[PDB]
């Protein structure tokens with residue numbers, strides 16, 4: 312259902328050059344997880360029914376940065392600002408989504424297709440649209456399904472985004488990585504989720520909710536058995552996520 | 560631009576009976592001002608661009624009651640609940656708007672036309688849409704004009720709603736009545752606004768903003784000179800306000 316806009320040849324060239332600079336920067340700084348969190352929090356506020364929120368550059372706003380959910384994303388914005396200044400032709404909207412695609416690529420994940428053209432919009436969405444780690448399967452469906460408009464398959468595959476990074480007790484209050492290799496994008500999140508608790512590793516109630524749901528669980532099983540299948544469904548869901556409200 | 564829905568004869572009959580019970584109740588309890596505030600806060604969250612908020616019964620929600628702007632409106636809701644229980648066929652949306660129309664009538668104001676049929680909606684709007692007493696003419700136009708979709712004339716006439724009632728230092732922090740007769744609906748708000756400060760009487764910065772605006776000021780002048788003209792424009796604006804997002 313997407314009709315992507317035309318951007319100038321100079322715009323396309325800056326996308327390709329920023330993509331490369333982003334790989335080197337994100338790899339050296341070890342910030343892929345944070346960058347994937349910035350792209351997701353930017354996109355995941357989309358509400359399909361009113362067409363507000365979504366990946367439109369507004370996360371750099373002090374007001375959206377203020378959102379509790381956005382704990383420490385002010386660091387992400389700060390880290391990218393010097394690099395962004397090198398590409399003044401690109402929208403922040405595009406640049407943040409491109410950082411998210413790069414974060415997944417440089418940690419070894421699938422190549423999520425990217426289309427430029429998102430415009431930077433003046434108003435951040437209301438606070439409170441991002442999911443709550445303490446809630447379960449109904450809440451995930453309200454958030455990904457009723458608000459963003461993603462499928463049940465997308466919810467499980469996108470949860471696998473937790474295969475990189477960690478929680479921090481000074482940010483959310485949860486603490487620690489989901490996997491033994493938190494800078495490597497793989498299907499380990501699902502493997503660890505299934506095998507139960509292990510010292511040093513995190514499972515949120517929202518992650519565990521995938522285990523008891525009649526539709527989520529067979530997807531958890533599929534992805535733990537077949538990383539190629541995880542990667543295919545992940546790239547599909549991330550692409551849709553990064554394009555919410557864009558080019559419809 | 561309004562196409563009002565059909566309601567059953569029994570619905571219409573309960574409107575007429577609740578109208579009368581509301582006059583006697585609101586007059587005896589001396590709560591017209593609070594009731595007009597409940598109706599306005601219920602309606603004034605309408606955002607035309609997304610069609611959210613507006614007079615749809617959601618102010619009774621603990622979550623909307625929580626809004627700081629709604630300081631003490633939990634009292635209003637409480638006062639009406641026994642009476643509402645006598646009219647289970649009416650929507651809360653209709654009942655609150657009818658209390659607002661009655662509040663204006665029983666204090667001596669114009670007869671604002673009323674049409675039933677508003678449905679009670681499940682989700683309260685986001686917090687922060689109601690105007691801020693410390694801001695000025697640009698802010699009033701953002702709020703009444705860009706969000707609700709009312710005219711410059713409606714802003715000035717609706718501000719005359721402050722001809723009844725008072726601020727309270729434990730609610731907003733402002734304190735006192737705008738007029739010497741705070742249970743009498745008349746053009747005194749504009750008379751007092753013009754004559755400057757007087758001991759015992761309140762003017763918010765938002766009220767004073769009407770004095771310095773090239774479009775608001777001649778309306779202030781007109782209404783201070785001609786109560787009949789105020790009443791005509793007030794009834795027009797209150798009607799539109801009470802119908803935001805309804806029967807379009």
Ligand code: HEM
Pocket residue numbers: 343344345347348351442443444445451469470471472473475476477478479480482483484485515517
């Ligand atoms: C299913 C609903 C989700 C919930 C309840 C949730 C909750 C959380 C929480 C509480 C944290 C810890 C923040 C901190 O303390 O630093 C976190 C981190 C993270 N989230 Fe999720 N999240 C969800 C979905 C997603 C999605 C869809 C993605 C991306 C595809 C994602 C990517 C990440 C990443 C990469 C981190 C680590 C950030 C870092 O290392 O600093 N999450 N999430």
Ligand code: HEM
Pocket residue numbers: 591592593595596599690691692693699717718719720721723724725726727728730731732733763765
């Ligand atoms: C122009 C923007 C407005 C601002 C900034 C504003 C602000 C305020 C504030 C700060 C209070 C005091 C609340 C308290 O401390 O108890 C108040 C009271 C009140 N407002 Fe306004 N208001 C505005 C517009 C309106 C409108 C459009 C109406 C209805 C037509 C209205 C009706 C009232 C009434 C009747 C009271 C007295 C409530 C009572 O006596 O308890 N106001 N307003």
